[PDB]
Amino acid sequence: QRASVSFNKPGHIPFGAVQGYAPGGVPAYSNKHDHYFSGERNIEDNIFFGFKYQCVEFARRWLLVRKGLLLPDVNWACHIFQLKEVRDAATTESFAVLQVRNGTTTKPEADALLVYPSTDANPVGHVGTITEVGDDYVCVADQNYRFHKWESSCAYKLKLDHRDGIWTIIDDIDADEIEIPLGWLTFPGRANRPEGAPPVALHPSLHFKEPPKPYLLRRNFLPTESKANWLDMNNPAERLFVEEFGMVSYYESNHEFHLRCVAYGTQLHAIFMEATAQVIESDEKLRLFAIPEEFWPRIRHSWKYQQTYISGRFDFAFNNETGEVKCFEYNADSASTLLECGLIQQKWAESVGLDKQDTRGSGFAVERNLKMAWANSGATGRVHFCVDEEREEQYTALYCMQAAEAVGLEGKLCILFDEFRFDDNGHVVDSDGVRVRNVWKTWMWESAITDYYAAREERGENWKPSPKDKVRLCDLLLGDDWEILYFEPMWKVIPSNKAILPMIYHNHPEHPAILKAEYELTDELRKHGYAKKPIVNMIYQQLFEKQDDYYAIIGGWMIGDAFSGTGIREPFAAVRIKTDKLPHPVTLKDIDKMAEDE
Numbered sequence: 001q002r003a004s005v006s007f008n009k010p011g012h013i014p015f016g017a018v019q020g021y022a023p024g025g026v027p028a029y030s031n032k033h034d035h036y037f038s039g040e041r042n043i044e045d046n047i048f049f050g051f052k053y054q055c056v057e058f059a060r061r062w063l064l065v066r067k068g069l070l071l072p073d074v075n076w077a078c079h080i081f082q083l084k085e086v087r088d089a090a091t092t093e094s095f096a097v098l099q100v101r102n103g104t105t106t107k108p109e110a111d112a113l114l115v116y117p118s119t120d121a122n123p124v125g126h127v128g129t130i131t132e133v134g135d136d137y138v139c140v141a142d143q144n145y146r147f148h149k150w151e152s153s154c155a156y157k158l159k160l161d162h163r164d165g166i167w168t169i170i171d172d173i174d175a176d177e178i179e180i181p182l183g184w185l186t187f188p189g190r191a192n193r194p195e196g197a198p199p200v201a202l203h204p205s206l207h208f209k210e211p212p213k214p215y216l217l218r219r220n221f222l223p224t225e226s227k228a229n230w231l232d233m234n235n236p237a238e239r240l241f242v243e244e245f246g247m248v249s250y251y252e253s254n255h256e257f258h259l260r261c262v263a264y265g266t267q268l269h270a271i272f273m274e275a276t277a278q279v280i281e282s283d284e285k286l287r288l289f290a291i292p293e294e295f296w297p298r299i300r301h302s303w304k305y306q307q308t309y310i311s312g313r314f315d316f317a318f319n320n321e322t323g324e325v326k327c328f329e330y331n332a333d334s335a336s337t338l339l340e341c342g343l344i345q346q347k348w349a350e351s352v353g354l355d356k357q358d359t360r361g362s363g364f365a366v367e368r369n370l371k372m373a374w375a376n377s378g379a380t381g382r383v384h385f386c387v388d389e390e391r392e393e394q395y396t397a398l399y400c401m402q403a404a405e406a407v408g409l410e411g412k413l414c415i416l417f418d419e420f421r422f423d424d425n426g427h428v429v430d431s432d433g434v435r436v437r438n439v440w441k442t443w444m445w446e447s448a449i450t451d452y453y454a455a456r457e458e459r460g461e462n463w464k465p466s467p468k469d470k471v472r473l474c475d476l477l478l479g480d481d482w483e484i485l486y487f488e489p490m491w492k493v494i495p496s497n498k499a500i501l502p503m504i505y506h507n508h509p510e511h512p513a514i515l516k517a518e519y520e521l522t523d524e525l526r527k528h529g530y531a532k533k534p535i536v537n538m539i540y541q542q543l544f545e546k547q548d549d550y551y552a553i554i555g556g557w558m559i560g561d562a563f564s565g566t567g568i569r570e571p572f573a574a575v576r577i578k579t580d581k582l583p584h585p586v587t588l589k590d591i592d593k594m595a596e597d598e
């Protein structure tokens with residue numbers, strides 16, 4: 001009936017899989033899906049090509065293999081069009097490129113970098129490689145645009161229009177979204193390196209140097225400008241926040257700290273998902289995780305049916321001396337503190353004047369990634385956002401709801417269960433008679449399980465749902481309709497259970513962020529030092545080694561499948577990321593931009 005959903009889209013190939021080869025033997029690797037950021041550098045033979053696998057990464061790696069020229073650092077792809085100078089990889093000698101505008105009498109040529117402008121859904125623009133030119137087409141090799149396995153030596157072919165001697169490359173593959181590139185960069189006077197030529201030997205001056213150690217430093221600040229009414233009371237979420245909490249100190253990181261969180265967060269999310277699958281398929285593990293046996297079929301169906309999810313938050317610890325990040329838990333079934341990270345902390349920074357050019361807020365990607373999670377969640381139609389009478393649950397719901405609605409979903413906030421009736425056929429419908437199909441909720445699956453059993457005593461087990469009956473939590477979350485999409489799905493209780501911590505350590509002891517953890521105390525744990533943590537028996541976890549006497553826990557947000565930001569609790573504290581200044585930016589608008597924006 002209703003079809004299974006997943007964040008993996010048909011015919012898109014996994015992250016890092018080879019899509020194909022541009023002429024001259026340059027592989028394009030999959031970046032999973034658009035706007036995906038891995039946090040992982042691609043460094044081969046001491047050359048830093050870019051982030052696995054963004055479009056500038058391919059451009060730089062292509063340019064080096066094909067022509068032996070090194071593309072300088074540039075943050076936004078569209079800014080490549082203002083490039084005047086690359087460097088010869090072997091000599092470091094400067095080499096001048098030629099800017100050729102699209103839509104003039106100059107025909108494009110093979111072995112040029114094609115640059116797309118910034119659009120509304122592609123703020124960074126795009127770069128690819130023109131591999132071949134015909135009388136009415138150009139072939140383009142790139143990364144991070146199309147995710148299919150290539151059938152030939154390019155990702156796609158673009159129309160090349162010719163009218164009155166004027167040549168215009170038009171991207172009209174997708175029907176509505178017609179994009180017209182800015183132009184392309186040629187490398188006049190530089191031949192392609194020979195077939196079979198030995199690899200390019202980068203001059204030692206141009207090798208990747210060790211970036212500075214991550215840092216996370218507590219700062220104390222006396223504001224220059226301080227705004228009194230810095231939240232928008234016409235936004236419901238912000239109004240409820242001000243009603244809970246009302247209208248200095250903060251944390252500053254560097255970009256290396258942020259990247260480590262993105263990389264470790266993304267990698268851990270996969271590790272936790274892998275261990276969740278092992279629990280799902282084991283009866284003994286389901287028992288250990290205190291899933292009642294009666295719900296085993298329900299939770300196993302959830303795991304197969306719904307591989308989408310909106311939010312989850314790691315708890316990280318960080319050591320400033322060693323740069324080490326460790327993970328204590330994945331609060332994978334929660335959205336608590338999202339609004340604070342995604343919005344409040346930036347608006348606070350602006351009010352006291354911290355929104356200077358030299359930093360950005362650490363929850364900058366949250367809003368965009370939320371919209372993206374909702375768009376690829378599988379939820380269509382009406383989504384009921386279901387909360388208790390707690391302001392925090394309400395404003396978390398409203399913030400997730402704003403994102404849903406921004407991508408064409410229709411939201412209804414439901415506080416407790418008065419919005420809902422059973423119709424003449426035993427189904428939960430709302431006050432518009434619309435039958436429930438999608439539920440985002442703050443209600444915990446454990447509370448639903450408890451409500452399920454209470455209702456079972458109260459109502460009987462011969463009980464048929466009828467229109468006279470009040471809808472309860474267990475009818476909303478654990479009803480006869482197992483094809484309702486739930487945000488956060490039922491299986492999400494598994495990665496959230498600390499019983500998983502020994503499993504991820506057994507599976508992945510090599511991972512730098514993984515704490516040693518066992519179900520029984522081992523002499524290794526006694527020697528290192530341990531904490532004994534209960535689970536709904538015990539787990540024993542290794543101990544992990546204060547600024548102005550403040551202990552701080554870092555929250556690392558997964559929003560859909562994207563690591564989307566950090567927030568701190570000492571009590572909620574703002575996190576600012578100091579921006580990497582480029583010494584030799586290609587254009588002034590590229591300063592303070594971030595490759596994370598792609």
Ligand SMILES: [Cl-]
Nearest residue numbers: 001002003380
């Ligand atoms: Cl459907």
